[PDB]
Amino acid sequence: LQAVRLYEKGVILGYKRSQRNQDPNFTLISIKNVNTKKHAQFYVGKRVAYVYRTTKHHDGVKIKCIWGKVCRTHGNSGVIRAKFKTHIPPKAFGDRVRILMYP
Amino acid sequence: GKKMIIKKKRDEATDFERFQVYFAKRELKKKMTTIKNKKN
Amino acid sequence: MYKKEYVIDCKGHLLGRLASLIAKELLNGQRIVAVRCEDINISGSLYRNKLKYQEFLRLRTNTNPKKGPLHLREPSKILWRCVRGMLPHKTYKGQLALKKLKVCVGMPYPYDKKKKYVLPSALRAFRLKKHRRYCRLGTLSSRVGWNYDTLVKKNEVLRKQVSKAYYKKKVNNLNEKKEIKTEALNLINPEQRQVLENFGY
Amino acid sequence: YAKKIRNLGKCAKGAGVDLRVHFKNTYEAARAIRRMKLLEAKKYLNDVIEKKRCVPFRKYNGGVGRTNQAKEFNHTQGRWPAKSCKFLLNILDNVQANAESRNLDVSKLRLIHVMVNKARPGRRRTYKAHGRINPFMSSPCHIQIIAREINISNQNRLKNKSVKKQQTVQ
Amino acid sequence: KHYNVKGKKKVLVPVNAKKTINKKYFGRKVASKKKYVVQRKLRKSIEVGKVAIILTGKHMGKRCIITKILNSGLLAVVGPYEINGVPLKRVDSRYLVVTSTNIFNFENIAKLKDDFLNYAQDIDDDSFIKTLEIKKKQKKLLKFMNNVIDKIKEIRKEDPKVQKLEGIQKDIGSLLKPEILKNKVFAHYLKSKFTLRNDMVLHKMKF
Amino acid sequence: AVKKVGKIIKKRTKKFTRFQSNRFMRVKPAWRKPRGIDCRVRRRYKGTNLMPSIGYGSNKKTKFLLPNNKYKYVVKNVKEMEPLIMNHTKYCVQIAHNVSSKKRKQIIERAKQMNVSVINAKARL
RNA sequence: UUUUUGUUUGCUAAUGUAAAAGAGAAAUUAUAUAUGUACCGGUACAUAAAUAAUCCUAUCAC
RNA sequence: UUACCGAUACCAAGCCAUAAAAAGAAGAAAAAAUUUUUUUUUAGAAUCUUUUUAUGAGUAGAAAAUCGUGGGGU
RNA sequence: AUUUUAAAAUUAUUUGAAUUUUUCUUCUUAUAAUUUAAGUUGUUUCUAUACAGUACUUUCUUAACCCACUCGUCUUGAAAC
Ligand SMILES: O[C@H](c1cc(C(F)(F)F)nc2c(C(F)(F)F)cccc12)[C@@H]1CCCCN1
Ligand SMILES: O[C@H](c1cc(C(F)(F)F)nc2c(C(F)(F)F)cccc12)[C@@H]1CCCCN1
Ligand SMILES: [Mg+2]
Ligand SMILES: [Mg+2]
Ligand SMILES: [Mg+2]
Ligand SMILES: [Mg+2]
Ligand SMILES: [Mg+2]
């Protein structure tokens, strides 16, 4: 096996939202097999990284990453809210995110 | 009941124990593979 | 919904609920193949359903029916339409989600060899009381002109035989594996064996 | 001229000040010409004058018919703007002459810049309706043509990271 | 030194004021008015001979045994180099998931504990932080490719503190290795990398 | 959004452009406050241009500090340069747009002597 | 098809991904029962019955 | 019956303005260097400075503070 | 440039009491220190041994999620057919 996971998989969903009001300050994350509030709480302090690819190289690379902290659980069904260093692009709304094991 | 207990055991296991189990499985696979080869 | 592509076996499901289930997943970011769409059930009585369909058909655009409500009468098509209804398809994300969905009548080329999933919170057996009238979608489609129902059924039947054949082989393989395991459990190491036994395997 | 050239030694220019031809037709012709060997362009112009090949009216396409020769440019509309074409041909000829006067081979010259700007309208009067005088102006043009002869950071930490990545890959 | 407020008993560690801040209407003064900062106090699972998984390093996922509570809060870790490949590595408590398994709980290795402790004690805090000179030297190589890397490695080796650390690691390996090898399964475990799979839920894990 | 750099907080980096300045050429971006009934901007409907307001203002303490943390001072002449001999860490010189090249050079030289930063030293360089 | 390096005059070397980290999993069918198996839809015997709460597949470098 | 989501409303914190309120006509601090140099400041502008608290919708309208244009004396 | 003081609290001492007999028992006589007082500081990286680069700033550019109806106007009321 080449490469080791060490993170839980996730899907970076919408922003924190009304019915028709945005709130880009928080993102909503679905974490693989976590379906309840209680389970969600386990991940609360863990660090989240949205890694993404680009055409132009930057710090000599095609992959860059934005970091976040995972702030609180979100309503009954294991979803969590995550707050990031800089707000996530909505291009990301169906994308994968990584929830690391540290803190 | 048995399956429940197995599940419980799995839940309660230490990382090392999981690793041990994995090792055992691997060993079995090796042996199993050999047996299969022999059969063939 | 973290899989590459979920194949959903649409037999024995309850239409609208199924559609709803699909839609959310699609939105999230999941490739869904709704397969075997002839056997999706609707919670109303068959006649009622038919009437509803007729009514829907009647609402066409008055000036030029080339545009307006396209009354797609294939069961798969109907399902797709339903899914779309439950989506923000007028945006870009919604459109993408819609595209991601694929609907099939019966079972085609690759989706016979892929694992078929079931949505338990949408099943007819779990959502309807058995004294209420339900309606098979294929039948409904046939009633409102689909024609290719019998053919589809035949195809399904044919596929079933193949599946059975494959299943037998699979069973045999499983048995063989079990036998091998039984043989080899004595050939490992005592402590290891014990450990294995303890952890169910 | 409008173009950024750098070396004018491999270029030959030609201009038309105030041409008595319609701006739109001429523009279309110019467009048709653009990015072509000079001789080929000339040939094309000649053909259009003799109504053999059409110029495709793609920009100013309001009311222009529907010719058979337009299929050549993947378009449906096209015309044979005679006077305009003639004017353009004249300018091309001038350009060629200029090139000759220097030391450019006419076979390897490509039109790199075919600009048509609209000059000031020549005012005339038309008479309408219930004693109404209206402008019957022309749409004159300037034509500008240019032919041309055609043949970090290291960072130690970053470096280390890169090395690590390479190792992992291996 | 310690303070016992509300029944916590927090334990104080002497700190130095480094940051200077501009005065309101005259000359600058030091930022810190406090002289003692409360000690880190690690979790009730971090011990002295437990095996832990490094989450973030280059040795990402490797299973390394804990060594010394290094006073600065962050602890020392070793995956006995000759077995796992993890050197004498300083690490924060957060970037390590400590397993419930302890080395000194096994019947074979429990007797060689005092020596291990002594070794740990011998390791110090200042032996890790690279002095500026070395860094400067390393930098100086930037102004072919692999050659540069080699040079850097050489420079690293040269460091006397580094050498000492290496020696210590070697000693530890010598002390520990054979016993580990003898417990074959354990050795294998030590060697292997911890990876999450499509069944390991993480939130229900009790490792 | 907010643009923290140092302790320097900027609340609103985006310029407030005039309503509809983006719709008719004749309307410049320069903020003008909309009057009259049915403005939408005046009424502050979700989705329109915002109205500049006093809440946006920067902390009294860091206000006219530039990214450098020095108040910009315009300089036309050596005499003017001189008031900032006792202030090189707090005001930074900008040489007037209309200064001739020799004079500019002289000013730059003076600045270097004073240890005072020049924000536009490169004009006509 | 395989390999190598790259995609760090309008051009004439050339980059993009709504989604890789194991994106693992082919009976069928009933839901007040199904599935096999063996005979003649019927009979007899097994088998699933928190069914993915599972199973498979990982790390054994040289 | 819980749980949750959910406003520019509420709370906690910052900053901006307005209003009011406290109050105001002399002095070395630190760091870096190596006991002495260097680096920063070393404040006192009454519609001003420092701090405190509360408050902030707005057409017709009123007022204040600013900003800009053509010329004049300085 | 003396309310970042005074006290509180805490630590190690010292004198006297108390009924809540107690390694956080309280008051109090005295002394030092500290912070739970008296609104965040420290450690290690990184940028980086760089003069501008693909990093960093910022302008523009499209995307994308959510929202957003032509302004002025008279009018109880204008996005107004
Ligand atoms: O929403 C109803 C309806 C529509 C359609 C569809 F548009 F897909 F053909 N199918 C329906 C069905 C369907 F047949 F199961 F699809 C059942 C009941 C109502 C339906 C119609 C729509 C017009 C007004 C109410 N009856
Ligand atoms: O009020 C004193 C004062 C005195 C005198 C003086 F007596 F010289 F005229 N003049 C002052 C002035 C002055 F009048 F402008 F000179 C202003 C402010 C304070 C003054 C202050 C006291 C603080 C130190 C400065 N002078
Ligand atoms: Mg109104
Ligand atoms: Mg209006
Ligand atoms: Mg107001
Ligand atoms: Mg809208
Ligand atoms: Mg009216």
Coordinates of N, CA and C (backbone and C1' of nucleotides) and ligand atoms in Angstrom, one line a residue, chain A residues 20, chain F residues 46, chain I residues 66-69, ligand 6:
Chain A
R20 N -32.7 30.8 2.1 CA -32.3 32.0 1.2 C -31.4 33.1 1.8
Chain F
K46 N -32.0 43.8 0.3 CA -30.9 42.8 0.1 C -30.5 42.7 -1.3
Chain I
rC66 P -28.0 28.6 -4.7 O5' -28.3 29.9 -3.8 C5' -28.6 29.8 -2.4 C4' -28.5 31.2 -1.7 C3' -29.4 32.2 -2.4 O3' -30.7 32.2 -2.1 C1' -27.2 33.1 -2.0
rC67 P -31.8 32.6 -3.2 O5' -31.7 34.2 -3.1 C5' -32.1 34.9 -1.9 C4' -31.4 36.3 -1.9 C3' -31.9 37.3 -2.9 O3' -33.1 37.9 -2.5 C1' -29.5 37.3 -2.9
rA68 P -34.3 38.3 -3.6 O5' -33.6 39.5 -4.4 C5' -33.3 40.7 -3.7 C4' -32.5 41.6 -4.6 C3' -33.1 41.9 -6.0 O3' -34.2 42.8 -6.0 C1' -30.8 41.4 -6.3
rC69 P -35.7 42.4 -6.4 O5' -35.7 43.0 -7.9 C5' -34.7 42.7 -8.9 C4' -35.1 43.2 -10.2 C3' -35.1 44.7 -10.4 O3' -35.0 45.0 -11.8 C1' -37.3 44.0 -10.6
Ligands
MG6 MG -33.9 35.6 -6.4

